[PDB]
Tab-separated table of C-alpha atoms and ligand atoms in Angstrom:
chain	number	residue	atom	x	y	z
A	170	UNK	CA	-124.913	198.417	97.560
A	171	UNK	CA	-123.046	196.876	100.500
A	172	UNK	CA	-122.251	193.178	100.888
A	173	UNK	CA	-125.209	190.910	101.574
A	174	UNK	CA	-123.630	189.848	104.877
A	175	UNK	CA	-123.777	193.516	105.905
A	176	UNK	CA	-127.564	193.297	106.188
A	177	UNK	CA	-130.100	191.128	107.992
A	178	UNK	CA	-132.361	189.165	105.675
A	179	UNK	CA	-135.583	187.922	107.262
A	180	UNK	CA	-135.373	184.154	107.782
A	181	UNK	CA	-138.644	182.237	107.559
A	182	UNK	CA	-138.321	178.495	108.374
A	183	UNK	CA	-141.582	177.817	106.527
A	184	UNK	CA	-140.092	179.108	103.270
A	185	UNK	CA	-136.321	178.801	103.703
A	186	UNK	CA	-134.544	176.498	101.236
A	187	UNK	CA	-130.848	175.488	101.302
A	188	UNK	CA	-128.954	176.808	98.253
A	189	UNK	CA	-127.491	173.429	97.279
A	190	UNK	CA	-131.072	172.301	96.663
A	191	UNK	CA	-131.197	174.568	93.607
A	192	UNK	CA	-129.647	173.805	90.235
A	193	UNK	CA	-129.518	177.181	88.497
A	194	UNK	CA	-130.208	177.252	84.761
A	195	UNK	CA	-130.876	179.667	81.906
A	196	UNK	CA	-132.123	183.279	82.260
A	197	UNK	CA	-135.896	183.799	82.097
A	198	UNK	CA	-137.956	186.678	80.728
A	199	UNK	CA	-135.059	188.563	79.171
A	200	UNK	CA	-135.287	190.475	82.450
A	201	UNK	CA	-138.820	191.862	82.184
A	202	UNK	CA	-139.236	190.755	85.797
A	203	UNK	CA	-135.636	191.560	86.662
A	204	UNK	CA	-132.856	188.994	86.950
A	205	UNK	CA	-134.786	185.715	86.915
A	206	UNK	CA	-133.356	182.294	86.063
A	207	UNK	CA	-134.827	178.844	85.488
A	208	UNK	CA	-133.867	176.302	88.137
A	209	UNK	CA	-134.484	172.820	89.491
A	210	UNK	CA	-135.349	172.444	93.160
A	211	UNK	CA	-134.643	169.226	95.033
A	212	UNK	CA	-137.232	168.302	97.639
A	213	UNK	CA	-139.157	171.564	97.540
A	214	UNK	CA	-141.940	169.683	99.316
A	215	UNK	CA	-140.865	168.076	102.599
A	216	UNK	CA	-143.074	165.062	101.840
A	217	UNK	CA	-141.110	164.303	98.666
A	218	UNK	CA	-137.416	165.099	99.314
A	219	UNK	CA	-136.233	163.137	96.259
A	220	UNK	CA	-138.491	164.930	93.787
A	221	UNK	CA	-137.254	167.591	91.362
A	222	UNK	CA	-139.401	170.655	90.667
A	223	UNK	CA	-138.872	173.307	87.989
A	224	UNK	CA	-138.929	176.766	89.556
A	225	UNK	CA	-138.191	180.406	88.761
A	226	UNK	CA	-135.571	182.236	90.816
A	227	UNK	CA	-135.415	186.017	91.173
A	228	UNK	CA	-132.271	187.694	92.498
A	229	UNK	CA	-130.587	191.102	92.612
A	230	UNK	CA	-128.474	192.406	89.728
A	231	UNK	CA	-124.773	193.217	90.118
A	232	UNK	CA	-125.570	196.944	90.190
A	233	UNK	CA	-128.249	196.558	92.871
A	234	UNK	CA	-128.640	199.218	95.551
A	235	UNK	CA	-129.931	199.079	99.124
A	236	UNK	CA	-133.293	200.161	97.695
A	237	UNK	CA	-133.399	197.249	95.251
A	238	UNK	CA	-132.750	194.813	98.090
A	239	UNK	CA	-135.573	196.316	100.146
A	240	UNK	CA	-137.938	196.054	97.179
A	241	UNK	CA	-137.160	192.377	96.542
A	242	UNK	CA	-137.702	191.591	100.217
A	243	UNK	CA	-140.903	193.652	100.250
A	244	UNK	CA	-142.074	191.814	97.147
A	245	UNK	CA	-141.411	188.478	98.867
A	246	UNK	CA	-143.091	189.466	102.137
A	247	UNK	CA	-146.055	190.860	100.196
A	248	UNK	CA	-146.483	187.540	98.403
A	249	UNK	CA	-146.538	185.792	101.789
A	250	UNK	CA	-149.388	187.971	103.048
A	251	UNK	CA	-151.422	187.919	99.826
A	252	UNK	CA	-151.371	184.121	99.883
A	253	UNK	CA	-151.856	181.494	97.187
A	254	UNK	CA	-154.142	181.313	94.150
A	255	UNK	CA	-154.213	179.206	90.984
A	256	UNK	CA	-154.088	182.239	88.701
A	257	UNK	CA	-151.154	184.169	90.157
A	258	UNK	CA	-147.409	183.518	90.229
A	259	UNK	CA	-147.004	182.038	93.709
A	260	UNK	CA	-144.140	182.073	96.184
A	261	UNK	CA	-142.524	178.660	96.625
A	262	UNK	CA	-139.534	179.445	98.837
A	263	UNK	CA	-136.451	181.573	99.453
A	264	UNK	CA	-132.699	181.549	100.059
A	265	UNK	CA	-131.735	184.239	102.576
A	266	UNK	CA	-128.603	182.844	104.229
A	267	UNK	CA	-125.081	182.040	102.975
A	268	UNK	CA	-125.190	184.176	99.839
A	269	UNK	CA	-127.346	186.533	97.713
A	270	UNK	CA	-131.106	186.767	98.273
A	271	UNK	CA	-133.103	184.264	96.201
A	272	UNK	CA	-136.885	184.482	95.887
A	273	UNK	CA	-138.312	181.216	94.546
A	274	UNK	CA	-141.582	181.375	92.608
A	275	UNK	CA	-143.683	179.321	90.182
A	276	UNK	CA	-142.365	178.643	86.683
A	277	UNK	CA	-144.411	179.359	83.556
A	278	UNK	CA	-142.808	177.631	80.570
A	279	UNK	CA	-144.864	179.240	77.794
A	280	UNK	CA	-143.898	182.869	78.387
A	281	UNK	CA	-146.147	185.886	78.825
A	282	UNK	CA	-149.676	186.104	77.440
A	283	UNK	CA	-148.735	188.523	74.640
A	284	UNK	CA	-146.045	186.348	73.025
A	285	UNK	CA	-148.174	183.271	73.764
A	286	UNK	CA	-151.056	184.617	71.680
A	287	UNK	CA	-148.879	186.080	68.914
A	288	UNK	CA	-147.200	182.717	68.299
A	289	UNK	CA	-150.653	181.189	67.855
A	290	UNK	CA	-151.828	183.753	65.317
A	291	UNK	CA	-153.497	182.183	62.264
A	292	UNK	CA	-152.058	183.063	58.823
A	293	UNK	CA	-155.463	184.553	57.998
A	294	UNK	CA	-156.978	187.993	57.515
A	295	UNK	CA	-158.408	189.197	60.834
A	296	UNK	CA	-155.076	189.330	62.689
A	297	UNK	CA	-151.600	190.766	62.143
A	298	UNK	CA	-148.857	188.393	60.994
A	299	UNK	CA	-147.427	185.637	63.202
A	300	UNK	CA	-143.975	186.920	64.244
A	301	UNK	CA	-142.920	183.593	65.749
A	302	UNK	CA	-140.411	181.274	64.089
A	303	UNK	CA	-141.968	178.530	66.208
A	304	UNK	CA	-145.739	178.882	65.702
A	305	UNK	CA	-148.068	176.730	67.805
A	306	UNK	CA	-151.602	175.408	67.318
A	307	UNK	CA	-154.367	177.981	66.881
A	308	UNK	CA	-156.624	178.663	69.872
A	309	UNK	CA	-160.381	178.130	69.762
A	310	UNK	CA	-162.891	180.847	70.651
A	311	UNK	CA	-163.438	179.239	74.058
A	312	UNK	CA	-159.738	179.210	74.825
A	313	UNK	CA	-159.553	182.995	74.474
A	314	UNK	CA	-162.551	183.721	76.698
A	315	UNK	CA	-161.148	181.185	79.160
A	316	UNK	CA	-157.867	183.132	79.179
A	317	UNK	CA	-159.787	186.271	80.140
A	318	UNK	CA	-161.752	184.344	82.754
A	319	UNK	CA	-158.626	183.034	84.488
A	320	UNK	CA	-157.000	186.470	84.553
A	321	UNK	CA	-160.215	187.975	85.935
A	322	UNK	CA	-160.261	185.270	88.618
A	323	UNK	CA	-156.690	186.103	89.586
A	324	UNK	CA	-157.535	189.793	89.860
A	325	UNK	CA	-160.705	188.975	91.793
A	326	UNK	CA	-158.513	187.189	94.319
A	327	UNK	CA	-155.917	189.971	94.395
A	328	UNK	CA	-158.668	192.540	94.936
A	329	UNK	CA	-160.059	190.469	97.805
A	330	UNK	CA	-156.620	190.724	99.442
A	331	UNK	CA	-156.586	194.525	99.052
A	332	UNK	CA	-153.975	194.255	96.289
A	333	UNK	CA	-153.836	196.841	93.504
A	334	UNK	CA	-151.651	195.767	90.577
A	335	UNK	CA	-151.249	199.192	88.906
A	336	UNK	CA	-149.920	197.617	85.695
A	337	UNK	CA	-152.246	194.820	84.613
A	338	UNK	CA	-151.271	193.872	81.066
A	339	UNK	CA	-150.730	190.824	78.848
A	340	UNK	CA	-146.977	191.206	79.367
A	341	UNK	CA	-147.587	190.766	83.103
A	342	UNK	CA	-149.540	187.539	82.705
A	343	UNK	CA	-147.585	184.283	82.454
A	344	UNK	CA	-148.638	180.984	80.875
A	345	UNK	CA	-147.756	177.612	82.393
A	346	UNK	CA	-147.070	174.307	80.644
A	347	UNK	CA	-150.725	173.440	81.277
A	348	UNK	CA	-151.905	176.726	79.737
A	349	UNK	CA	-152.855	178.221	83.101
A	350	UNK	CA	-152.978	182.019	83.222
A	351	UNK	CA	-150.912	183.451	86.091
A	352	UNK	CA	-150.707	187.153	86.928
A	353	UNK	CA	-147.169	188.418	87.529
A	354	UNK	CA	-145.586	191.354	89.390
A	355	UNK	CA	-148.508	192.152	91.706
A	356	UNK	CA	-146.446	192.715	94.852
A	357	UNK	CA	-144.186	195.446	93.502
A	358	UNK	CA	-143.314	198.424	95.692
A	359	UNK	CA	-144.946	201.594	94.370
A	360	UNK	CA	-142.425	204.217	93.252
A	361	UNK	CA	-142.290	207.127	95.695
A	362	UNK	CA	-141.157	209.529	92.963
A	363	UNK	CA	-143.258	211.213	90.279
A	364	UNK	CA	-143.821	209.189	87.109
A	365	UNK	CA	-142.165	209.662	83.721
A	366	UNK	CA	-144.917	209.346	81.118
A	367	UNK	CA	-142.548	208.470	78.268
A	368	UNK	CA	-140.307	205.734	79.681
A	369	UNK	CA	-139.623	202.425	77.925
A	370	UNK	CA	-139.136	198.926	79.349
A	371	UNK	CA	-139.036	195.856	75.407
A	372	UNK	CA	-140.358	198.990	73.722
A	373	UNK	CA	-143.573	198.967	75.741
A	374	UNK	CA	-145.326	202.125	76.929
A	375	UNK	CA	-147.123	201.344	80.238
A	376	UNK	CA	-149.046	204.623	79.907
A	377	UNK	CA	-151.446	202.940	77.456
A	378	UNK	CA	-152.797	200.600	80.149
A	379	UNK	CA	-153.481	203.319	82.719
A	380	UNK	CA	-156.947	204.587	83.568
A	381	UNK	CA	-157.419	208.337	82.946
A	382	UNK	CA	-157.565	209.069	86.698
A	383	UNK	CA	-154.333	207.128	87.222
A	384	UNK	CA	-152.827	208.795	84.169
A	385	UNK	CA	-153.689	212.400	85.032
A	386	UNK	CA	-154.120	212.374	88.820
A	387	UNK	CA	-152.005	209.317	89.715
A	388	UNK	CA	-154.960	207.741	91.522
A	389	UNK	CA	-154.811	203.933	91.656
A	390	UNK	CA	-157.795	201.846	92.754
A	391	UNK	CA	-159.301	198.452	91.969
A	392	UNK	CA	-161.397	200.321	89.402
A	393	UNK	CA	-158.223	201.486	87.663
A	394	UNK	CA	-157.173	197.831	87.449
A	395	UNK	CA	-160.579	197.150	85.883
A	396	UNK	CA	-159.726	199.664	83.159
A	397	UNK	CA	-156.429	197.858	82.568
A	398	UNK	CA	-158.270	194.536	82.372
A	399	UNK	CA	-160.281	196.097	79.552
A	400	UNK	CA	-157.095	196.799	77.615
A	401	UNK	CA	-156.004	193.246	78.437
A	402	UNK	CA	-159.292	192.009	76.970
A	403	UNK	CA	-158.500	193.925	73.787
A	404	UNK	CA	-155.015	192.377	73.791
A	405	UNK	CA	-156.474	188.868	73.962
A	406	UNK	CA	-158.891	189.151	71.034
A	407	UNK	CA	-156.266	190.793	68.853
A	408	UNK	CA	-154.009	187.889	69.846
A	409	UNK	CA	-151.333	190.139	71.319
A	410	UNK	CA	-152.144	193.362	69.502
A	411	UNK	CA	-150.656	196.736	70.412
A	412	UNK	CA	-153.116	199.141	72.120
A	413	UNK	CA	-153.964	202.391	70.305
A	414	UNK	CA	-151.960	201.545	67.166
A	415	UNK	CA	-150.304	204.618	65.669
A	416	UNK	CA	-151.261	206.833	68.599
A	417	UNK	CA	-148.362	208.536	70.442
A	418	UNK	CA	-148.463	209.461	74.145
A	419	UNK	CA	-149.050	213.201	73.756
A	420	UNK	CA	-152.091	212.458	71.598
A	421	UNK	CA	-153.276	209.760	74.013
A	422	UNK	CA	-153.772	212.313	76.803
A	423	UNK	CA	-156.144	214.406	74.694
A	424	UNK	CA	-157.955	211.446	73.116
A	425	UNK	CA	-158.794	209.722	76.416
A	426	UNK	CA	-160.195	212.964	77.830
A	427	UNK	CA	-162.358	213.383	74.735
A	428	UNK	CA	-163.917	209.983	75.411
A	429	UNK	CA	-161.974	208.246	72.653
A	430	UNK	CA	-161.782	204.459	72.979
A	431	UNK	CA	-160.250	201.648	70.929
A	432	UNK	CA	-162.483	200.140	68.256
A	433	UNK	CA	-163.692	196.551	68.477
A	434	UNK	CA	-161.133	194.023	67.201
A	435	UNK	CA	-162.134	192.276	63.960
A	436	UNK	CA	-162.615	188.925	65.688
A	437	UNK	CA	-164.581	189.901	68.793
A	438	UNK	CA	-168.249	189.451	69.723
A	439	UNK	CA	-170.339	192.525	70.524
A	440	UNK	CA	-170.937	191.268	74.061
A	441	UNK	CA	-167.207	191.023	74.762
A	442	UNK	CA	-166.646	194.484	73.290
A	443	UNK	CA	-169.285	195.973	75.583
A	444	UNK	CA	-167.313	194.387	78.421
A	445	UNK	CA	-164.248	196.335	77.273
A	446	UNK	CA	-166.311	199.520	76.993
A	447	UNK	CA	-167.804	198.933	80.436
A	448	UNK	CA	-164.263	198.534	81.792
A	449	UNK	CA	-163.329	201.730	79.952
A	450	UNK	CA	-166.112	203.802	81.505
A	451	UNK	CA	-165.026	207.375	82.215
A	452	UNK	CA	-166.446	207.223	85.735
A	453	UNK	CA	-164.463	204.784	87.949
A	454	UNK	CA	-167.529	204.050	90.094
A	455	UNK	CA	-169.465	203.003	86.997
A	456	UNK	CA	-166.993	200.316	85.888
A	457	UNK	CA	-167.840	196.696	86.768
A	458	UNK	CA	-165.990	194.943	89.595
A	459	UNK	CA	-163.783	191.892	89.089
A	460	UNK	CA	-166.385	189.806	90.923
A	461	UNK	CA	-168.952	190.833	88.312
A	462	UNK	CA	-166.428	190.256	85.516
A	463	UNK	CA	-165.746	186.705	86.704
A	464	UNK	CA	-169.487	185.985	86.774
A	465	UNK	CA	-170.101	187.335	83.261
A	466	UNK	CA	-167.046	185.638	81.758
A	467	UNK	CA	-168.131	182.373	83.388
A	468	UNK	CA	-171.466	182.586	81.586
A	469	UNK	CA	-169.787	183.510	78.305
A	470	UNK	CA	-167.255	180.651	78.472
A	471	UNK	CA	-170.070	178.100	78.741
A	472	UNK	CA	-171.793	179.631	75.709
A	473	UNK	CA	-168.693	180.201	73.574
A	474	UNK	CA	-167.885	177.478	71.032
A	475	UNK	CA	-164.545	175.672	70.843
A	476	UNK	CA	-165.264	174.455	67.309
B	4	66T	C1	-145.042	188.167	91.511
B	4	66T	O1	-144.658	187.722	90.200
B	4	66T	C2	-143.366	187.348	90.028
B	4	66T	C3	-143.020	186.813	88.792
B	4	66T	C4	-141.716	186.411	88.550
B	4	66T	C5	-141.314	185.826	87.215
B	4	66T	C6	-141.211	184.329	87.393
B	4	66T	C7	-141.305	183.558	86.108
B	4	66T	C8	-140.952	183.885	84.854
B	4	66T	C9	-141.256	182.828	84.111
B	4	66T	N1	-141.131	182.596	82.770
B	4	66T	C10	-140.599	183.431	81.835
B	4	66T	O2	-140.145	184.527	82.098
B	4	66T	C11	-140.603	182.928	80.427
B	4	66T	C12	-140.778	181.591	80.075
B	4	66T	C13	-140.773	181.205	78.733
B	4	66T	C14	-140.589	182.170	77.723
B	4	66T	N2	-140.583	181.836	76.405
B	4	66T	C15	-139.540	182.189	75.438
B	4	66T	C16	-140.271	182.367	74.090
B	4	66T	C17	-139.337	182.924	73.007
B	4	66T	N3	-140.847	181.080	73.665
B	4	66T	C18	-141.895	180.603	74.580
B	4	66T	C19	-142.405	179.201	74.186
B	4	66T	C20	-141.396	180.603	76.041
B	4	66T	C21	-140.417	183.492	78.076
B	4	66T	C22	-140.427	183.855	79.412
B	4	66T	N4	-141.780	181.894	84.899
B	4	66T	N5	-141.824	182.302	86.124
B	4	66T	C23	-140.763	186.550	89.554
B	4	66T	C24	-141.106	187.085	90.788
B	4	66T	O3	-140.129	187.187	91.710
B	4	66T	C25	-140.489	187.458	93.074
B	4	66T	C26	-142.423	187.488	91.028
């Protein structure tokens, strides 16, 4: 709410970057991650001060409150503690002095996993239509399993750092220029108020990624993330399909309790569908861990054909 000079932003010499070392560019995400722009950073690495690096910059909106500022800081500090990994969106730096708070993170040029897969939908029969006006090359069967593997690896790391995502979905996984899967928004502050089960975002309903125990009793564990990973698996092999198609929220509550699960996608092996079902086990303690998931998916990648 108040001016940014009215507060005391935490300075960290290890991460602090002068503002004139950033060339701000076009908006990124259409604000799914909040106000984030593309930018070029000059001498992000001290060893190469004359090198330009493409980065993503998150900042507060014009209507931001004192709460929003605290959250963005908390998000930044959380990313510091969690540390680095190949398959997450990493912290690269920050601008905390002489202006608005800037949190500098890694840039993924190919958008989120959902739109990434949809644009690479074949004009065939076992997928919905390609909605992209700029379709890219189809992905092999080993590329899809590899996508799941990388996401699992990211979550395995996050879990090892006591991090619970609470909203693992294809929309929250970003794809780099080198087709590297990176998990996004894992350091978000958990809302202290009771949840609205029918809120929108695009027109996405986050309730369809929640484990039953998180849905009904608001209990979030690593096992609830495992459930979400199952839905993410289903998203991958439908190439960006919408979970529980035609099923509204009020019907989803009843269905899940009755043991109802999504059917196997048309193009999905039985082994990979069992993995989804295992992730969608009613008992949280009976779901596989991310460590186990990474091991299985590693085996499956080696056996899956890219022809
Ligand atoms: C912890 O986690 C995060 C993640 C972020 C987000 C950072 C980010 C966002 C992006 N990237 C995009 O948002 C993006 C890029 C390309 C897109 N598209 C457009 C589409 C039409 N065509 C496609 C070919 C490409 C669509 C979206 N990178 N880094 C910020 C953050 O603050 C602290 C923390």
